[PDB]
Structure 1
Amino acid sequence: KIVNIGAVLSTRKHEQMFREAVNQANKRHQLNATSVTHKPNAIQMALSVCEDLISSQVYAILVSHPPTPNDHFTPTPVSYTAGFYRIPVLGLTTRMSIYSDKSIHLSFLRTVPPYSHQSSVWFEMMRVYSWNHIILLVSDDHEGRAAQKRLETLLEERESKAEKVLQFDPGTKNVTALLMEAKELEARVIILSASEDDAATVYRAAAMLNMTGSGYVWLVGEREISGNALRYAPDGILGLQLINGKNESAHISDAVGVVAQAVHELLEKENITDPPRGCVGNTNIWKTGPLFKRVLMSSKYADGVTGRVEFNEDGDRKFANYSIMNLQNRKLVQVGIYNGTHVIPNDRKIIWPGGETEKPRGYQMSTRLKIVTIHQEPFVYVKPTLSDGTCKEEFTVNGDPVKKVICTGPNDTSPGSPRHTVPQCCYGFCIDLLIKLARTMNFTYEVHLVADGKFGTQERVNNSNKKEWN
């Protein structure tokens, strides 16, 4: 009646704890256990996993993140080796979203939500605080891409879209060119998604550009407020943390309970094929592997240490507790707790960047209204200005002065020319209407022509099938 199970842990003490926990689970309701520590060389580590657990015919592999802070150090080789036989592994403390793509990792159930799921929390923070116009800073990795995709596919339901989405490159130390673009936007709330080093770099770049002043609100992921970022984060960061996210012990206990429950459910089913005894010399998919993964992905464990353990369709834990954290005097302070589809605040004060104690709406009205205008004869006359700086002062037949604007457009009307953005003087019917609107609409217009010099239709992109507006 032996049912084996395998696990790869960070240290021997955690291995002994896992053995004690699995013994307690067995005593609660005939089930073996084995363990092995991590190894530096990924290839050798995977070979050891293969030759130790697979030779022992395990049913699941409990994999946990190692002490060293290296991305994809533990899970990827173990996940690949197990998914070769469709043996379902249980991640413990790895929040990278690359494991949420079942196309690559065929069998990977984990008991912590990914970093991408934090996107949903942002929506909740945008709901209670009534924020609709946001900007989103995202790295060009799978993690950032996944976070952006989740946020967009969850925001499109509310018929809302981000004001701008700005991409990164994983390692660039110069992002001020992008913060310059971020300056000229009405949305004044920034949602970051980047690693600790990239978070520190963007914090350093934004500090010199006064994006940390009053009227700005920052929403920042869990891993972008820990470490060096915590040293450079401005006051008022609305970061997130997991409840017992780093607690390997609670996750180990909860995962072994879930796996024991799933094994008990499985052995009561119809004929079940044993897992292959030897990793070497075997190239067949474990026929009951997909069934075991399916029953794992649907088992409900409402008696867990970390609360109810329910997996979503993608194979990741759902309804996880997120704790909000505001940075005050260079020290994180608990503010609220989000459990699921609802964020709850507390009596602790929330000081936004700049020291404001209100709920600053990040919708700078701006009222600049950069205006384009085509040169049309009866409506918008365009003429060269004088050397004094301003265009001359004509007069109407009735003696009234004619209103003129400092148009910024290209002198060379000839196509295929090095267009020079020189200021002409433009005036006329449409210009007079614009003056009336500005006088009544509080406008501060910056009129400028169009480089194309055309009204603009939907032109097909050169050597493509995409529509484009000129």
Structure 2
Amino acid sequence: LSSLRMAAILDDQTVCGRGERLALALAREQINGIIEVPAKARVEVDIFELQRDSQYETTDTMCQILPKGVVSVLGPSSSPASASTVSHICGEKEIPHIKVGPEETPRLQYLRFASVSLYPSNEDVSLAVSRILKSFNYPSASLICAKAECLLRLEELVRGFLISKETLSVRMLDDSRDPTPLLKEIRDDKVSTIIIDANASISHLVLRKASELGMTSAFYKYILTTMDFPILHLDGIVEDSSNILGFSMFNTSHPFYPEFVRSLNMSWRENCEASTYPGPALSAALMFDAVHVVVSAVRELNRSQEIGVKPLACTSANIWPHGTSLMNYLRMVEYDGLTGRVEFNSKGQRTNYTLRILEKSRQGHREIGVWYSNRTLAMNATTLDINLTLVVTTILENPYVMRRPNFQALSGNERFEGFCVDMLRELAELLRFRYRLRLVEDGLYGAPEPNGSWTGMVGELINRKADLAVAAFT
């Protein structure tokens, strides 16, 4: 019982960082600022940076941390191979792993389960996208995976759908990081729901070229599966109706969250003036919840027995004596923090947690409800946004719709007279919505025709050119 050392393994940059150093310094500040009785175990957290994602350098870093008398390691944020090396080193030394990052490695049970995971499972996020697509009544969707690892991260979504070009067709971004050809294939393949899987910048490129293709209006429903969604900024693509969904994990009711975002906002401007501070990184919030989970579980351990910390060496195989006990005390703990509730099931995954679902709206986001860990999704919690002037097409046939003396503004008002013109006039005078007339494209009433589609005004309606064809169609 000297103190409580820990290990931070980071995958950020000093300038314009996601902010894990600030998160863990703020957390150590907070839990040292809690004044318990007596002057109890003052928590410190040691920062160990890690430059490139490489299992050899991770092993070097882990080997440095194990003699430093760590009680639990956490991180790295966005390096999955480095995370797997950390996980197996600490799983053989029985140091508890707290994975704040995603799971892009194929997780095997034969790799022992000495690793809790604050980040929600790939199987859970896959079930969330599958229940969103159920509550769109199963539209003919289409994945746009940035990397092959999408198929690992969305394994349950893919194998729960008949892969075809009418239920789920998977398309993958190429080495060029340019999304225009597969977005073009999506457009002329007549699909609507687009599930984009990638990080923030690559999903940003896909949605930007989706707006610069024309596929951003209310026909298309984008489901972004980045749980680092709400730090996006889709100015210029945030439209009146754009259906850009996404997930989020912030109980923004939390009593620390405004000063949390304020401190990270301040420490973003000081560290770099590159752009505005886009909001808090989910990995930063997860590292906050991580060090709180470790402090609560180790304080529960020290409340029942005495813990002992001994400097372990990478060479020899001194197993930490309280490995399974801290694993039980970790996988029993419940926290209420910046990712909602933190409760773990038996496997060390996460459960009883609530994914807020956001929609990209006028300035930022506006929820479509929540998706729970076990039960289904309440798509109406704020409101269910299924609720998301006209064009009057006409032939010009006497005496039903007869042309006026075509010198003045023969459009809207002067465009005709006769039974049709006053008919539509009184009709939308009653139904109370303005609609401007336009003479037809062909000049025939049109026939359902053998070139695929219809001819004339029939096709003019059918291809959704105008709104109401109000003229003597038989």
TM-score, normalised via structure 2 length? 0.58
SS state of the match for residue 186, structure 2? helix
Corresponding residue to 2:94 among 82, 86, 90: 86
In the superposition, relative to structure 1, how do residues 218 and 307 fare at CA in structure 2: closer, same or farther (>3 Å)? closer
Matches within 5 A, 1:343-362: 343-344=377-378, 345-348=380-383, 350=385, 357=388
Pick aligned residue for 1:192 from 193, 196, 202: 196
1:61 aligns with: 73
- Which amino acid in 2 is paired with 1:125? I
For 2:144 and 2:174, the matched residues in 1 are separated by 12
* Structure 1 residues 77 and 207: CA distance shift in structure 2, 3 A: same
* TM-score between both structures, scaled by the size of structure 1: 0.58
- Percentage of pairs with the same residue: 17
Are 2:2 and 1:8 aligned?
no
* Cα distance between partner residues in 2 of 1:294 and 1:444: 69
Cα shift at 1:91: 3.2
User: Which residue in the other structure is 2:296 paired with?
Assistant: 257
**Which residue in the other structure is 2:46 paired with?**
36
- Preserved CA contact (<8 Å) 1:239 1:324: yes
The count of corresponding residues between Structure 1 and Structure 2 is 344
Q: 3-state SS of the aligned residue for 2:137?
A: coil
Specify the alignment match of 2:350 in structure 1.
317
**Cα shift readout 1:234-283 (whole Å, capped 9, x = no counterpart):** 53201111115443545532442134335656x49xxx9x6652324413
> Contact conserved, 2:245 with 2:359, CA < 8 A, in 1?
yes
Judge conservation of contact 2:298–2:329 (CA < 8 Å) in 1.
Answer: no
Q: Which amino acid aligns with 2:376?
A: H
* Mapped partners of 2:119, 2:303: distance in 1: 23
- The separation in 1 between residues aligned to 2:26 and 2:231, in whole angstroms, is 30
Where 2:234 maps in the other structure, the secondary structure is helix
What SS is found at the alignment partner of 2:356?
strand
Q: Is the 8 A contact 1:203 1:229 kept in 2?
A: no
Structure 2 contact 8–75 (Cα < 8 Å) conserved:
yes
Structure 1 unaligned blocks of 5 or more: 358-440, 447-470
Out of 180, 183, 190, the position equivalent to 1:179 is 183
- Confirm or deny that 1:279 pairs with 2:319: no
Q: Secondary structure at the match of 1:117?
A: helix
How far 1:318 moved relative to its partner?
A: 1.7
Report the AA paired with residue 289 of structure 1. Answer: G
Per-residue displacement from partner, 1:27-62 (whole Å, max 9, x unpaired)?
A: 5997574421232546677645533x4224433224
Q: Do the aligned partners of residues 32 and 118 (structure 1) sit closer, same or farther apart at CA in structure 2, a change above 3 Å counting?
A: same
1:231–1:300 Cα change, 3 Å: same
- Preserved CA contact (<8 Å) 1:111 1:317: yes
Question: Alpha carbon RMSD of aligned pairs, Å?
Answer: 4.5
- Output the amino acid matched with 2:132: M
**1:185 positional shift:** 4.1
The whole-number CA distance in structure 2 between the counterparts of 1:206 and 1:96 is 28
Question: 8 Å contact 1:100–1:314 — kept in the other structure?
Answer: no
> What's 1:145 paired with?
151
Q: Summarize the alignment of residues 151-166 of structure 1 with structure 2, pairs less than 5 Å apart.
A: 151-153=157-159, 163-166=167-170
| Pairing partner for 1:296 from 325, 330, 334 | 330
